[PDB]
């Protein structure tokens, strides 16, 4: 019987069988009073405190969320939905330790994606109790508010501020340094990670004076906080705040009274008019995410990053060698999970119409120079290989380059992996390739359940990468030092090294994108 | 083993066996069948062009190393044979330039782009390709080691080739 | 002594540690502990570093043994606090006899219990730890004899004695190698012969006793040292290294086994400078001068010898690895000690 006293009462946890040992695991302890009522659209406040013992013995509420219907009875995208009930009174976090009990054990907090609208920490991949089994870690997870209901904003009102989901994050990071030493844990050995909208979180935590204290290094997969769809404008959040209320019959003059119309909606009502408050979406779309809102971000992070005003720390970067084509199934003209989705000139032309609603004619046409450029052959897969890779270079590779570059301009260690590995278990077809999200569960070690139908090549892969991870969150260096592996290089912002992750032929090898990269980065930020 | 390796003392050849049968891992049936392929290339050509590129280059001069890795769609070889030793050459020679001859088109262009550079250090010490940006081919020196991939996808840097068996050949093997 | 030294006169923030053989991996492993951190300022390592093959006992070993000693003296339970609650009635002498035989094969040079990575006093594999720079950053002086493995030859190699000049065959040095290396595989052993019995040439009786005390010193003793002296300066800090190769004037152990392993501590600790006990004046001047060293590297972390025109002692760093010779004739800088020896224990052994 295993029960930790934390600031705020007793917690009762569960054993794990793993791997011939056990794991305990806390699911679902709160972390915020529910934000119901008045509370709905405000930073997240701390909890009052209980006698008893309360029982976290099992996943808590998904926060409030629109579902993926685009594949209903597919695994390969109901793999990505909530598992738990949906309710606003979501705002828990789950915790794993190593048994016996560690004595000053590092912790790694994950931060899921999923758009900022989005996710829930309690998904199959994102099961801790590996790296505690195998690493002698404690993982953190924590579910934070998504969509409006986490990043409504109107600037400097504190009935809706923005960010919330942000506050969330962090205010689970700070109960880790209130709470985690009871656990065993060390609250001066946190690493974050997290995965595309994690990732950016991740880096916007980074940027945030009021994280910096909370937390000791930072992984991100997949994301940074300088890719296109990961911060809202003042503008754009301005508009879409009012659309949403123009939609929910909500239109008011006082702006605090918008708000105290929209928390009368119940939240089917605020859900259903989430996707319509811009005119056009697209697959990569984030209608409500992080602004500049003068408390967690006082800049535009952009100028932040330049001028070198974040947290001086390792990170670890990187990407997948195809980011871009899990989205072409969701509108692009020809693509489709049930073919091999040969398209043809004009269907990749309207594919740029699709993820580029508007820009320019020449905007676009540029793209379409830049990319289709054969050598040569003519090959049938270009124009579908090509639109993947202007999708995966544009919203996630580039933009994380540049964001390794610019931190490791500011004097840091920096690391940054090219992951290049297509699960054996991918129920995905064949032409997307490595797609986005399918590092992960080689990160969370599921490779190294042997019951589980995975090679020998991948339980060897996600052991290397679990070691490097777990090496990296307690000492800041990647390596994995024992079985004669590839070291793995700093990233400068002269040489650029990178390592390939891979069952094959582990490299060192220089400049990924570096033409690609260099249109997207210098040239189309101006059109 | 045998075959390849007469006299050769027993220590000597399970040397050879115990640096080249280490696997990762799985167990891959071809892994002995890929194994001897990749023993009797390192010890007989590619270890010692390394090695003499690299004395070479530390007295002073300019020196250029490629890794060729395209397969001819015309090899009359099976396919576990890979890029063969002698298969380069038709591509310097730019038989793929004939149309008439049925290459693919990416070897055309492949072999174009081999002829020019080799042409280019000819007629001027420098293996370019200048005119369609083409990975620039930068000089092998003795700490980095840099060489360049020849092959119909992507060409590419890289550093140290075979750096672990060309070790066990190269300073290892002469003493048994 | 952090809590009680001033009171004796003794200053707590300036402690070395110094142990010798386990004490000196001791005194690596306090280096590795976030515990021990605060409680000493330097260390000095003779004739021993944690990554020694004998230094650590693995957590699949540990386990191994603690349920043989327990079958052994009629402890096997099912629940763990209950073994150690028999194991906590048999009496010390019954503990004591058991241990040798918890192991199948040991040698001359087996640690059947010792530090262990327990997630307390050691976080993490050890090696791990130094390879990734986290240790307490400070100055080290290392040091090895010359003779490091003669002394565990006459512990059950066939054909050593003390009695005798002890030369023997290649087929006793053959013996000799599964002595010390249980099991190490047919493979294992031959690349050691190869590597050690390379003979320039002559072909010299004594090559193969010469050989086999090289291989069981380089393999337990000098090759560890020195990798953890370069891994531990590559973290920035000052190190130092000796090799001490001066043989007692009043070894009591024969001529072959020359500088031995454990004896220098009692040149250390001055000994020599008793008049009244029948060691040389050479060997006077010589522990005078390396008492002097020691207290000038505990006092003030350089242990230079500044008042008699003696050769200065370089810092040992990665590129050069300078290290100074301790004898009565010409005290000399010299450069990476046992290279061809210890790339060969150090890069090609841990793999087979
Ligand atoms: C800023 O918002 C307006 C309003 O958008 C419309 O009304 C919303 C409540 C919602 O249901 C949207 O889908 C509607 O588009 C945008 O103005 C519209 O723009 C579209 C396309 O340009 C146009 O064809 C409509 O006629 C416009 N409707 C109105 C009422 O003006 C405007 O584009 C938004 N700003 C952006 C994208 O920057
Ligand atoms: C792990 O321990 C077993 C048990 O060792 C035996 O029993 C002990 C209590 C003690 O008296 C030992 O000397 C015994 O050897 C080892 O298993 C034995 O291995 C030897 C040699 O390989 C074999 O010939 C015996 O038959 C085995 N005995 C049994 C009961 O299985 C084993 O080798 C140990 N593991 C190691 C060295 O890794
Ligand atoms: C657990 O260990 C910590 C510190 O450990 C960390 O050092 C951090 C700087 C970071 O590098 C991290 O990855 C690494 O593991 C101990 O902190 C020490 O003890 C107290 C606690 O506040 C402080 O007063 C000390 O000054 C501090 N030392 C250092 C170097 O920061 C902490 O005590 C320990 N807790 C245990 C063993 O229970
Ligand atoms: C690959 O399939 C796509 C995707 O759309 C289709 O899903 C298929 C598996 C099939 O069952 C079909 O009924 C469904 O629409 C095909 O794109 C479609 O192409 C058809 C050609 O008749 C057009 O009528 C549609 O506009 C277009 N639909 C959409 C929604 O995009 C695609 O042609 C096919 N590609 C192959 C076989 O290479
Ligand atoms: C004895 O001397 C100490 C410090 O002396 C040491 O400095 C260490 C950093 C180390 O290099 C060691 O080899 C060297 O001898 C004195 O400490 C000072 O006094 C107090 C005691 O705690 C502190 O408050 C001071 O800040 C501190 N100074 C320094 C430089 O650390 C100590 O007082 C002294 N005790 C006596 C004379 O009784
Ligand atoms: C040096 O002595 C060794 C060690 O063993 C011996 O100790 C001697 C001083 C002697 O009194 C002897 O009785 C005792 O065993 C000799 O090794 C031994 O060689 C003999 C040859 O008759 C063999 O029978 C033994 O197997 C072997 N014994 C052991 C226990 O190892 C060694 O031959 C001798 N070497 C010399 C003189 O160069
Ligand atoms: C929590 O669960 C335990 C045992 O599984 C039970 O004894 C206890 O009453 C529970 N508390 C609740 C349901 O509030
Ligand atoms: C807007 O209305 C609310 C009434 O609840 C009030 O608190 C606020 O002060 C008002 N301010 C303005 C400027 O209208
Ligand atoms: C290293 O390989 C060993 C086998 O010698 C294996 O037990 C272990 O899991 C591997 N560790 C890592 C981190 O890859
Ligand atoms: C370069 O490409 C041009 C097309 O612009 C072609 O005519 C020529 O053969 C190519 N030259 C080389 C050396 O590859
Ligand atoms: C084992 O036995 C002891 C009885 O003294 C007890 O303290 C401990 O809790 C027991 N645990 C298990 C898991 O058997
Ligand atoms: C140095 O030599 C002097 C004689 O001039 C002697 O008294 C002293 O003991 C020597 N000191 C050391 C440290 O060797
Ligand atoms: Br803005
Ligand atoms: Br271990
Ligand atoms: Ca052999
Ligand atoms: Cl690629
Ligand atoms: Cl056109
Ligand atoms: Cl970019
Ligand atoms: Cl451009
Ligand atoms: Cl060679
Ligand atoms: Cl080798
Ligand atoms: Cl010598
Ligand atoms: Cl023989
Ligand atoms: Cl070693
Ligand atoms: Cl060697
Ligand atoms: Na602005
Ligand atoms: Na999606
Ligand atoms: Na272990
Ligand atoms: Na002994």
Same mark, same amino acid.
């Given at each position: 019987?295993?029960?930790?006293?934390?600031?705020?009462?007793?917690?009762?946890?569960?054993?794990?069988?793993?791997?011939?040992?056990?794991?305990?695991?806390?699911?679902?302890?709160?972390?915020?009073?529910?934000?119901?009522?008045?509370?709905?659209?405000?930073?997240?406040?701390?909890?009052?405190?209980?006698?008893?013992?309360?029982?976290?013995?099992?996943?808590?509420?998904?926060?409030?969320?629109?579902?993926?219907?685009?594949?209903?009875?597919?695994?390969?995208?109901?793999?990505?939905?909530?598992?738990?009930?949906?309710?606003?009174?979501?705002?828990?976090?789950?915790?794993?330790?190593?048994?016996?009990?560690?004595?000053?054990?590092?912790?790694?907090?994950?931060?899921?994606?999923?758009?900022?609208?989005?996710?829930?920490?309690?998904?199959?991949?994102?099961?801790?109790?590996?790296?505690?089994?195998?690493?002698?870690?404690?993982?953190?997870?924590?579910?934070?508010?998504?969509?409006?209901?986490?990043?409504?904003?109107?600037?400097?009102?504190?009935?809706?501020?923005?960010?919330?989901?942000?506050? #969330?994050?962090? !205010?689970? /990071?700070?109960?880790?340094? *209130?709470?985690?030493?009871?656990? =065993?844990? +060390?609250?001066?050995?946190? %690493?974050?990670?997290?995965?595309?909208?994690?990732?950016?979180?991740?880096?916007?935590?980074?940027?945030?004076?009021?994280?910096?204290?909370?937390?000791?290094?930072?992984?991100?997969?997949?994301?940074?906080?300088?890719?296109?769809?990961?911060?809202?404008?003042?503008?754009?959040?301005?508009?879409?705040?009012?659309?949403?209320?123009?939609?929910?019959?909500?239109?008011?003059?006082?702006?605090?009274?918008?708000?105290?119309?929209?928390?009368?909606?119940?939240?089917?009502?605020?859900?259903?008019?989430?996707?319509?408050?811009?005119?056009?979406?697209?697959?990569?779309?984030?209608?409500?995410?992080?602004?500049?809102?003068?408390?967690?971000?006082?800049?535009?992070? #952009?100028?932040? !990053?330049? /001028?070198?005003?974040?947290? *001086?720390?390792?990170?670890?970067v =990187?990407? +997948?060698?195809?980011?871009? %084509?899990?989205?072409?199934?969701?509108?692009?003209?020809?693509?489709?999970?049930?073919?091999?989705?040969?398209?043809?000139?004009?269907?990749?032309?309207?594919?740029?119409?699709?993820?580029?609603?508007?820009?320019?004619?020449?905007?676009?046409?540029?793209?379409?120079?830049?990319?289709?450029?054969?050598?040569?052959?003519?090959?049938?897969?270009?124009?579908?290989?090509?639109?993947?890779?202007?999708?995966?270079?544009?919203?996630?590779?580039?933009?994380a380059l540049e964001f390794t570059k610019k931190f490791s301009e500011?004097?840091?260690?920096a690391?940054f992996?090219?992951?290049?590995?297509?699960?054996?278990?991918?129920?995905?077809?064949?032409?997307?390739?490595?797609?986005?999200?399918?590092?992960?569960?080689?990160?969370?070690?599921?490779?190294?359940?042997?019951?589980?139908?995975?090679?020998?090549?991948?339980?060897?892969?996600?052991?290397?990468?679990?070691?490097?991870?777990?090496?990296?969150?307690?000492?800041?260096?990647?390596?994995?030092?024992?079985?004669?592996?590839?070291?793995?290089?700093?990233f400068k912002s002269?040489?650029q090294?990178?390592?390939?992750?891979?069952?094959?032929?582990?490299?060192?090898?220089?400049?990924?994108?570096?033409?690609?990269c260099?249109?997207?980065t210098?040239?189309?930020?101006?059109?």
């Amino acid at each position: 019987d295993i029960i930790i006293a934390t600031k705020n009462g007793k917690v009762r946890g569960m054993q794990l069988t793993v791997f011939g040992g056990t794991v305990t695991a806390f699911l679902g302890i709160p972390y915020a009073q529910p934000p119901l009522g008045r509370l709905r659209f405000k930073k997240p406040q701390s909890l009052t405190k209980w006698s008893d013992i309360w029982n976290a013995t099992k996943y808590a509420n998904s926060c409030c969320q629109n579902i993926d219907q685009s594949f209903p009875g597919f695994h390969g995208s109901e793999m990505w939905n909530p598992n738990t009930d949906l309710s606003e009174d979501c705002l828990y976090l789950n915790v794993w330790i190593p048994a016996p009990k560690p004595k000053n054990a590092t912790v790694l907090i994950w931060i899921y994606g999923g758009h900022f609208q989005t996710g829930t920490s309690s998904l199959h991949v994102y099961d801790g109790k590996f790296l505690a089994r195998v690493e002698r870690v404690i993982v953190v997870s924590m579910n934070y508010r998504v969509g409006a209901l986490g990043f409504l904003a109107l600037p400097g009102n504190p009935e809706a501020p923005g960010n919330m989901g942000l506050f #969330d994050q962090q !205010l689970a /990071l700070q109960w880790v340094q *209130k709470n985690i030493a009871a656990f =065993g844990g +060390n609250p001066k050995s946190v %690493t974050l990670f997290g995965e595309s909208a994690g990732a950016a979180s991740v880096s916007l935590h980074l940027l945030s004076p009021g994280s910096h204290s909370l937390f000791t290094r930072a992984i991100l997969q997949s994301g940074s906080f300088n890719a296109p769809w990961a911060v809202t404008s003042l503008y754009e959040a301005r508009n879409r705040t009012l659309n949403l209320a123009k939609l929910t019959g909500c239109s008011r003059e006082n702006e605090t009274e918008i708000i105290k119309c929209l928390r009368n909606k119940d939240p089917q009502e605020i859900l259903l008019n989430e996707a319509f408050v811009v005119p056009y979406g697209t697959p990569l779309s984030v209608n409500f995410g992080p602004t500049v809102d003068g408390d967690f971000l006082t800049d535009m992070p #952009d100028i932040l !990053l330049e /001028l070198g005003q974040f947290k *001086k720390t390792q990170i670890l970067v =990187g990407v +997948n060698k195809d980011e871009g %084509t899990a989205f072409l199934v969701y509108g692009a003209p020809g693509f489709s999970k049930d073919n091999n989705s040969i398209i043809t000139r004009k269907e990749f032309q309207e594919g740029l119409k699709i993820f580029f609603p508007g820009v320019s004619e020449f905007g676009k046409e540029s793209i379409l120079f830049h990319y289709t450029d054969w050598v040569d052959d003519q090959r049938p897969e270009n124009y579908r290989e090509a639109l993947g890779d202007v999708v995966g270079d544009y919203n996630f590779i580039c933009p994380a380059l540049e964001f390794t570059k610019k931190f490791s301009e500011w004097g840091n260690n920096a690391f940054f992996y090219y992951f290049e590995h297509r699960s054996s278990k991918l129920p995905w077809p064949e032409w997307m390739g490595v797609m986005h999200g399918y590092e992960i569960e080689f990160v969370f070690g599921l490779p190294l359940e042997r019951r589980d139908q995975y090679t020998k090549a991948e339980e060897i892969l996600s052991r290397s990468i679990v070691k490097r991870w777990a090496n990296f969150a307690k000492y800041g260096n990647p390596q994995e030092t024992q079985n004669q592996s590839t070291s793995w290089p700093v990233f400068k912002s002269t040489e650029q090294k990178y390592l390939t992750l891979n069952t094959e032929s582990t490299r060192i090898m220089t400049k990924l994108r570096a033409q690609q990269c260099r249109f997207w980065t210098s040239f189309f930020p101006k059109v």
